[PDB]
Amino acid sequence: VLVNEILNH
């Protein structure tokens, strides 16, 4: 939840 939001999919 500190990077996932980005690569999120």
From Swiss-Prot:
- Judging by the UniProt lineage, the source's domain of life is Eukaryota
Per the entry, what this protein does is: (Microbial infection) Forms amyloid beta-sheet fibrils in semen. These fibrils, termed SEVI (semen-derived enhancer of viral infection) capture HIV virions, attach them to target cells and enhance infection. SEVI amyloid fibrils are degraded by polyphenol epigallocatechin-3-gallate (EGCG), a constituent of green tea. Target cell attachment and enhancement of HIV infection is inhibited by surfen. Also similarly boosts XMRV (xenotropic murine leukemia virus-related virus) infection.
- The protein depicted here goes by the name PAPf39
Organism equals Homo sapiens (Human)
- Show which stretch of the intact protein is covered: 262 to 270 of 386
